[PDB]
Amino acid sequence: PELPEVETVRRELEKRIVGQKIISIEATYPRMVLTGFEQLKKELTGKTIQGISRRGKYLIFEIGDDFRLISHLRMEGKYRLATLDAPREKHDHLTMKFADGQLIYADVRKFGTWELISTDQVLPYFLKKKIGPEPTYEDFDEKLFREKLRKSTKKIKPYLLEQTLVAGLGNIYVDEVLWLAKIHPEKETNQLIESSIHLLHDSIIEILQKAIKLGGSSALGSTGKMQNELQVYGKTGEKCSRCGAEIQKIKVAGRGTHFCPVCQQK
DNA sequence: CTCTTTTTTCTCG
DNA sequence: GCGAGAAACAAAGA
DNA sequence: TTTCTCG
Ligand SMILES: O=c1[nH]c(=S)[nH]c2[nH]c(=S)[nH]c12
């Protein structure tokens, strides 16, 4: 999941589990609780969920007054809300049980993580990861963005994916963003001129805010509609510009990369 | 049998 | 620094 | 790394 899907999950969770008391926590895969399942079980049991926030692709459960559970879904993490008597499915790893239902975390590839953090350690946690600004007009300052692009020789697609220029882009939306900004994924960022950087800046914000509006692309968050709006991701061999160009797929810095060669020249 | 495909972090030259 | 490659893991799809 | 797929 990328920022839009996580934000969709956040919103659904906010509606359903805020105000609920955690009755018990169970794990068939405790190793995904990086700070220690035992400790997490002991601190959070009996606590009431006060809210859910998000930073980039990270979910943040606000539980009791002094704890935060930071959850990352990585590649295939999924939450679902189920009755207390729901059967176990094969890749369920964790469950937070309430009085009248449970929240189950599943992850086929086991990449997803949980970390229990002190409330005043949350801001330092994201500082250490060097996570960039949220993709909004208010937080995503184009001037700093521009200064960083100009000082670097990195290719624009893997640089954007670093989460440091701006938070929340993953493989789908960076491909959609570069298509929309008419920029080649392998463009060296110090070659970008001012007007391209401006278009790229706005496009990053516009695409992500749109995806959020449509509930993300495709359990919680499984009713998204952004996938219908995708212009290049996963559409190899299909048309992009009303002239005849087909979408090409190449490998860039280890990632499958979809682009329209005629519209996205260097 | 083999290989490649689908977020974050680490190695290493 | 930097980037190429791989690690963590499961299930495809060839 | 493990298992499936027409296997
Ligand atoms: O956190 C990341 N760091 C790097 S270097 N690349 C990358 N690609 C995605 S997606 N996330 C990240």
CATH of domain A1-132: 3.20.190.10
Nearest CA to ligand 1 atom 2: A162
Question: What technique was this entry resolved by?
Answer: X-ray
Q: Do domains A1-132 and A133-266 have the same CATH topology?
A: no
Q: Resolution of the experimental model in angstroms, please?
A: 2.2
Reply yes or no on whether A21 is catalytic.
no
- Residues in contact with ligand 1 by the CB-under-6-Å rule are A 161-163, 170
Tell me which DSSP letter residue A188 carries: B
Cα A127 from chain centre: 17
For the range A223-226, what are the long-range contacts, defined as Cβ-Cβ under 8 Å and sequence gap of 24 or more? A224/A4, A224/A5, A224/A8, A226/A4
Question: What contacts A131, CB < 8 A, 6 or more positions away?
Answer: A55, A56, A163, A164, A167
Tokens read off for A205 = 């914000």
Question: Which 3-state string (H, E, C) describes A115-128?
Answer: EEEEHHHHHHHHHH
- How many angstroms separate the CA of A245 from the C1' of B1? 40
**To which H or E segment does residue A148 belong?**
helix A142-150
Q: Smallest Cα–Cα separation from A218: which of A233, A228, A232, A207?
A: A228
Closest Cα to residue A143, out of A165, A173, A168, A164? A165
Nucleotides of C under 7 A from a protein CB: 2-6, 8-11
Known catalytic residue at A1: yes
Quote the Cα angle for A48-A53-A55, to 5°.
145
Q: Report the CATH number of the A133-266 domain.
A: 1.10.8.50
Q: Per residue in A166-199, is it b (16+ CB within 10 Å) or e — as a string?
A: bbbbbbbbbbbbbbbbebbbbbebeebeeebbeb
Structure-token match 């606000």, residue found: A62
* Structure tokens belonging to residue A115: 């970390």
- Please calculate the CA angle A26-A30-A34 and round it to the nearest 5 degrees: 125
From A57, A81, A55, A49, select the one nearest A4 (Cα to Cα): A57
Three-state SS for A35?
A: coil
Domain boundaries, chain A: 1-132, 133-266
For residues A23 and A97, the answer to whether their CB atoms sit within 8 Å is yes
CA dihedral A119, A1, A32, A94 (to 10 degrees): 90
A158 Cα–ligand 1 center, Å = 7
- List the residue whose alpha carbon is closest to atom 10 of ligand 1: A170
